[PDB]
Design a protein around this ligand. Structure first.
Ligand SMILES: [Mg+2]
Ligand SMILES: [Mg+2]
Ligand SMILES: [Mg+2]
Ligand SMILES: [Zn+2]
Lengths: 143, 129, 49, 143
RNA sequence: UAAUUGGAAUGAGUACAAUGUAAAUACCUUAACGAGGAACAAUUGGAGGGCAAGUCUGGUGCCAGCAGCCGCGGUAAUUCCAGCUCCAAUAGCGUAUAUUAUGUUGCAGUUAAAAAGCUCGUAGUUGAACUUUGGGCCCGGUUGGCCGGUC
RNA sequence: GUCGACGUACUUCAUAGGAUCA
């Protein structure tokens, strides 16, 4: 119950944002041909700093060589690499622990299960690629 | 029957590099296949290659080296104006700063960021990324 | 306990582009040039009757 | 290729092929032929007049029951007689017999504990005045 | 939580006047009046709560359910949910009907929409490769680096 | 004529699967 949060406003999230990418955000970006950095600019209408965690990068490197273009996208120089103090576990678990320990990232992901478990935590907006672009759900500073 | 010879060439390269082979044999070979391949070669997607010569259409042998993710042809060679360059490269590339759309202008066969500089346009052939 | 599988039949003459000719005429040919205006004026004048 | 042509001189084929296989789309043939409203109960209209033919459940003991609230109403365009709801059961005193009720669709979004399948209309104006303006005692019914 | 009360503030309105305008009216400006329930009396919708010496229905008792503007008196008298609690939009708010968020890009056809029984065939769409390639010299644009002479 | 073949309009039938607990 941090000093920033209102009832559900969560006013420590502000421009420029910091998003956390899941492993199937990348897949549906490559599939629907949106681009990471400009796609988040085109929805949030603010600067962005996509972040990728050591658990997620390990998972990408675990996929193999059929998915090497997504790995090429993830080692891009202007996607920063947040390092994580973990054993090295499943990606979605590492995302949930990051979210609970700081409550100032928005989470870009596409699996339904991780969507539910994030939605329990109050004040964490939740980007996801749908249709043709990056729709954002629980952010009260949209337009 | 056989209509696009370039489509056959790029499909044969694509198949025989998916499966991991090392050199490809593509029969026939127009001037367009040589120039499209020299454009792919300049950017490092294929190794050298060589035209072997019978007294017929002629064959090519390409030396692949791994770095090729996809290549293809756009089949009606659509006329592309100068803003349609960037609508085309947003439709058919998975991230808008790698991969090259290749197009046939009055100044040669070239990728798109060379046809931006020279300020030309023309028809559209294919793509690599 | 032997059940055979259904042979899914093949229709007879009842296809949405053949229904249009079953009445007196070719009903595709008696249409309008602006269906939106036909709709909004038809509704309003219905209410004013 | 796929089923369709693709050469750069076949717009005429593609344009005719869309112009034929477009009459096989029920909303298209519905909205050009002008069939689009026999779905709707009233004609083309949005309200419809009617004569109060009689009351139903005027001898029903259980108060505020739905069959207490329903009158039976003849429409003046067709001649067909239907049943109609009435809000606020006290407003059965306002409609008598040979009133002109002006009916509107009931259009209910949901179905309650003891409701009725079959009432599809509802009474809006009784002999010129409106039932919210008689029940709220603004106006009164001009006989 | 407030339910009394203390003075300060102002315009809706009314108005000498001037301005406005062809002439007026109104705005803008302004003497004099003009706020306690500031009775100088905001609205449209939907969700809940209780209302018994009441009625009605059903039953494995005192119950349940519907409902409750209907009770024992009383209507110049009863002075009662002071006048039940929330929620949303707000000088705006609701209801009905429609409509809105076919495939060029970009659909589907073995097994659940849909490949004509078959081949020939005119229009239509579509159609293999090839013809000056390559080198040498000069000129400088416009950048980028070493530069920054400058007050 | 509670007539047939259509053409419109509408209705309805088919929804549970795993895991743990009792
Ligand atoms: Mg079938
Ligand atoms: Mg022919
Ligand atoms: Mg040719
Ligand atoms: Zn971790």
């Amino acid at each position: 119950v941090s000093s920033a949060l209102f009832f559900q406003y969560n006013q420590a999230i502000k421009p420029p944002y910091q998003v956390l990418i899941d492993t199937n955000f990348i897949n549906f970006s490559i599939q629907k041909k949106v681009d990471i950095v400009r796609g988040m600019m085109d929805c949030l209408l603010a600067k962005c700093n996509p972040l990728i965690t050591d658990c997620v990068m390990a998972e990408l490197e675990k996929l193999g060589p059929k998915y090497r273009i997504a790995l090429k996208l993830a080692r891009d120089p202007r996607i920063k690499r947040l390092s994580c103090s973990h054993k090295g576990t499943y990606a979605d678990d590492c995302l949930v622990h990051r979210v609970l320990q700081h409550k100032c990232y928005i989470v870009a992901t596409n699996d339904a299960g991780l969507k539910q478990r994030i939605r329990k935590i109050p004040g964490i907006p939740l980007m996801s690629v749908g249709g043709h672009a990056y729709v954002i759900e629980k952010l009260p500073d949209v337009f | 029957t056989r209509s696009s010879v370039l489509a056959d060439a790029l499909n044969a390269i694509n198949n025989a590099e998916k499966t991991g082979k090392r050199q490809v044999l593509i029969r026939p070979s127009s001037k367009v296949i040589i120039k499209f391949l020299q454009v792919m070669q300049k950017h490092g997607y294929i190794g050298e290659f060589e035209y072997i010569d019978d007294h017929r259409s002629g064959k090519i042998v390409v030396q692949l080296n791994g770095r090729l993710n996809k290549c293809g042809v756009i089949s009606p060679r659509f006329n592309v104006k100068i803003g349609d360059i960037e609508k085309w490269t947003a439709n058919l590339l998975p991230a808008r700063q790698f991969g090259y759309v290749i197009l046939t202008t009055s100044a040669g066969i070239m990728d798109h960021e060379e046809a931006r500089r020279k300020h030309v346009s023309g028809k559209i052939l294919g793509f690599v990324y | 306990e032997q059940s055979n599988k259904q042979h899914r039949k093949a229709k007879e003459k009842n296809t949405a582009k053949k229904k249009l000719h079953t009445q007196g005429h070719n009903a595709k040919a008696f249409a309008v040039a602006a269906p939106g205006k036909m709709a909004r004026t038809m509704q309003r004048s219905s209410d004013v009757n | 290729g796929k089923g369709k042509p693709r050469g750069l001189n076949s717009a005429r084929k593609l344009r005719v092929h869309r112009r034929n296989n477009r009459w096989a789309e029920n909303n298209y043939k519905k909205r050009l032929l002008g069939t689009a409203f026999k779905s709707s109960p009233f004609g083309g209209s949005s309200h419809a007049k009617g004569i109060v033919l009689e009351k139903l459940g005027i001898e029903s003991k259980q108060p505020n029951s739905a069959i207490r609230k329903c009158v039976r109403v003849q429409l003046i365009k067709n001649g067909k007689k239907v049943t109609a709801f009435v809000p606020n059961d006290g407003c059965l005193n306002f409609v008598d017999e040979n009133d002109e009720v002006l009916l509107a669709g009931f259009g209910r979004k949901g179905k309650a504990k003891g409701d009725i399948p079959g009432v599809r209309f509802k009474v809006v104006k009784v002999s010129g005045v409106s039932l919210l303006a008689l029940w709220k005692e603004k106006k009164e019914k001009p006989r």
